[PDB]
């Protein structure tokens, strides 16, 4: 009975840090995907398990819009079976992933003179994230043989690092807004359908 609220996600006034990535459920609505892709203002738009052209013909269940900001060189990690600080420690897609990754450059918005240090990422963690896990803790990471007991110092690291987006950064060091659309193929009452979708 609704059109899917993609404006609230994509045109959102604020974006989360990748480590505290934001998840919005999308349900009980019709998603015109073509208005996103045919309005191609996106540096990245790759799908997994479906083809971008057949999306308006499909119905899904359990549809989620995850969103965050990362660097250009890290968009590569928002994909199944990747490795690196983002995929291991911040946002991990399953290997069986069905969904679309969408990304665009936000230097115009997320960069400030002298640096924008609001966006953070996790640099250390005792283990890799399971798919779709979310870790927002700030405990000192013990990289050595002595327990930190909440004190930063030698081998005792605050787990989060700022990006520091500056307008003159190289493109791979510039901020990108990312939206991951996660679907599950139809095996239950459909929650979201394309305009020409078959239940």
């Amino acid at each position, epitope marked *: 009975t609704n059109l899917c609220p993609f404006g609230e996600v994509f045109n959102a006034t604020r974006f989360a840090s990748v480590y505290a990535w934001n998840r919005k459920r999308i349900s009980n609505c019709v998603a015109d995907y073509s208005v996103l892709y045919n309005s191609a203002s996106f540096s990245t738009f790759k799908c997994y398990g479906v083809s971008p052209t057949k999306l308006n013909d499909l119905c899904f269940t359990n549809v989620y819009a995850d969103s965050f900001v990362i660097r250009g060189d890290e968009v590569r990690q928002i994909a199944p079976g990747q490795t690196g600080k983002i995929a291991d420690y911040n946002y991990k897609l399953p290997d069986d992933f069905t969904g679309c990754v969408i990304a665009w450059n936000s230097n115009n918005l997320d960069s400030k003179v002298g640096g924008n240090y609001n966006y953070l990422y996790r640099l250390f963690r005792k283990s890799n994230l399971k798919p779709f896990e979310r870790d927002i803790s700030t405990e000192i990471y013990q990289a050595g*043989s*002595t327990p930190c007991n909440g004190v930063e110092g030698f081998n005792c690291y605050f787990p989060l690092q700022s990006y520091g987006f500056q307008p003159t950064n190289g493109v791979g060091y510039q901020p990108y807004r990312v939206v991951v659309l996660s679907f599950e193929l139809l095996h239950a009452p459909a929650t979201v359908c394309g305009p020409k979708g078959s239940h």
Partner: antibody
Amino acid sequence: QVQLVESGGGVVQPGRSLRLSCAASGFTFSSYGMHWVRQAPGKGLEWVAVIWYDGSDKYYADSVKGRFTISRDNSKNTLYLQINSLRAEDTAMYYCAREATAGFDYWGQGNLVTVSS
Amino acid sequence: NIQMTQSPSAMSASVGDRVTITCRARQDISSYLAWFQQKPGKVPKHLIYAASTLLSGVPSRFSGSGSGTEFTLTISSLQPEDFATYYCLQHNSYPYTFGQGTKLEINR
């Protein structure tokens, strides 16, 4: 006053065994990981091994793995380095070092091991 | 083993000179590079960790720089008591590895 006092070195014949001790006092020994470093005469520093504060995780340089074993007794407040099958390359000053948030901030004075017949 | 290489092996400089000592890592070790000072007949002294953080009490003339595989220790105003052998050590991953050392002598 933090003090690391080392013992157990001296002359030893090749192929025999030795056990170096590092007695800690003046701090809570069980709260700190500990490292062994050595220096053959006239040569550079060499990282030997590290043991976790509780005694669990242990790590060794490649050149000493399998022959050296690091250990510790938190009730005796004492760190140990066991060296089997002593060779000429093992002649060195051996130092223990506390790992803290301030850094490698406390070292023992050094214990000389001379592998000689 | 992450191999560490220091250059030069030895050097001299006058009191008040700026001195830089270089450490190269065979693999990327990010910024996890420590510096130590050893005066003949004394225990090593830990001066710097994480490439550029000074330990407490280290005089201001000592400074650290670098990230990745290239690191420098700088003494901005060399003092006679700075005569020593200086060692770098990567603390990126076990086993920790020392470089071979740079002996620093005072020209007078």
